[PDB]
Amino acid sequence: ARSTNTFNYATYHTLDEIYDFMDLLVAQHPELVSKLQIGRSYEGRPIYVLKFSTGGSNRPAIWIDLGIHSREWITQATGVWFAKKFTENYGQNPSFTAILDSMDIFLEIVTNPNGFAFTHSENRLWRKTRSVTSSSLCVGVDANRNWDAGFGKAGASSSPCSETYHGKYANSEVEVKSIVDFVKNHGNFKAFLSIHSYSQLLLYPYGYTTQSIPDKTELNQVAKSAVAALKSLYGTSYKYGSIITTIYQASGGSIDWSYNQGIKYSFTFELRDTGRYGFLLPASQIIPTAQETWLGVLTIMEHTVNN
């Protein structure tokens, strides 16, 4: 409505509603947050990032992106809630004020604008981008199989109509390239988190290879504590481990590419639930879900600022 304070956070919103909300949030807290357009989607929709910052140099940053798979509605909704929480706790929660006084947070609420819009008017279960320009009748690419980390290897499909089709070449999707260029140009991101649904899992690299990352013992300990934190509010249980060891071999994922850029704290959360609702989580589960990942995400940020 006419305030983020009167915005309903326990209901699923449309693309316009989410873009509207960003403008109101900035309008209310211009000192702490600004909106940045990092590119345009296949269909020409602007792609935005909300940058939270108290100021400073090319400060160490924390990247978070939600909704790369459009049907996972619990994610873009969680992002909306996260944005408001960042403005509420600054100046209030000790640990969070510490992180924001030394680091910036970049939050991409609707990473896949076209697919999201499509889930609101055409197919609620659409999860890919909406790119065409190919030798097929089927459209789109699975934006989480499109990164340059083991691209084209076992773990993604080469079938255009496939829901996990990887695309013509690594980073062919503008939605993927928009993030890569922004993160690389910056050259100072210390954490890269991707948020999906469902199956309640905290993942770290890799997905495209059995090789164990050198930072495994640490990232494993970071995941272990993050899972314990999250579980504390309602008892929601997550399993954690490498992508390949605990979900499946998946190539061309964002966290493997990011970790390969040298961004150490690379993780992906697969939110609620484990299958009863899957993608159609009840609106009543939004704030509760948002509340708990906040604990697991804050743990990871705490580790990054301190380690």
Binding-site positions for substrate read 69-72, 127, 144-145, 197-198, 248
- Of the residues 174, 250, 290, 300, which one makes contact with ligand BIP according to CB under 6 A: 250
Nearer to ligand BIP, 22 or 202 (CB): 202
Question: What's the CA gap between 81 and 98, in Å, rounded?
Answer: 20
Q: For residues 84 and 196, which CB has a smaller minimum distance to Zn ion in the complex?
A: 196
CA dihedral sign, ordered 18, 24, 26, 29? negative
Query: 3-class SS at 166?
Result: coil
Smallest gap from residue 184 Cβ to Zn ion (A): 23
Binding mask 206-225 for ligand BIP (x = CB under 6 A): -x------------------
If you search the block for the tokens 């209030």, which residue do you land on?
92
Q: Which residues are catalytic?
A: 270
Tokens of 243: 């992508």
State which amino acid sits at residue 109.
I
Choosing among Zn ion, ligand BIP, none, which partner's interface includes residue 243 (Cβ < 5 to 8 Å by kind)? Answer: ligand BIP
- Which residue in the shown chain puts its C-beta closest to ligand BIP? 253
Stretch that binds ligand BIP, among 28-36, 179-187, 232-240, 243-251 (CB under 6 A): 243-251
Give yes or no for residue 203 binding ligand BIP (CB under 6 A): yes
Q: Which of 46, 55, 21, 194 is nearest to 114 (CA)?
A: 46
- Residue 141 or residue 203: which is nearer to ligand BIP going by CB? 203
Residue positions in the annotated binding site for Zn(2+)? 69, 72, 196
Secondary element (H or E) of residue 155: none
b/e sequence 150-165, b meaning 16+ C-beta within 10 Å = bbbeebbeeebebbbb
Options 82-90, 127-135, 249-257, 287-295: segment touching ligand BIP (CB under 6 A): 249-257
Rounded CA separation 19/47 (Å): 10
Select from Zn ion, ligand BIP, none the partner in contact with residue 270, using the beta carbon and a kind-dependent cut-off of 5 to 8 Å. Answer: ligand BIP
Nearer to ligand BIP, 140 or 207 (CB): 207
| Sheet containing strand 61-66, strands side by side | 33-40, 46-52, 104-108, 61-66, 189-197, 265-271, 201-204, 239-242
Residue 64 found at the interface with ligand BIP (CB under 6 A): no
User: Which residues would be at the binding site for ligand BIP (CB under 6 A)?
Assistant: 144, 196, 203, 207, 243, 247, 250, 253, 255, 268, 270
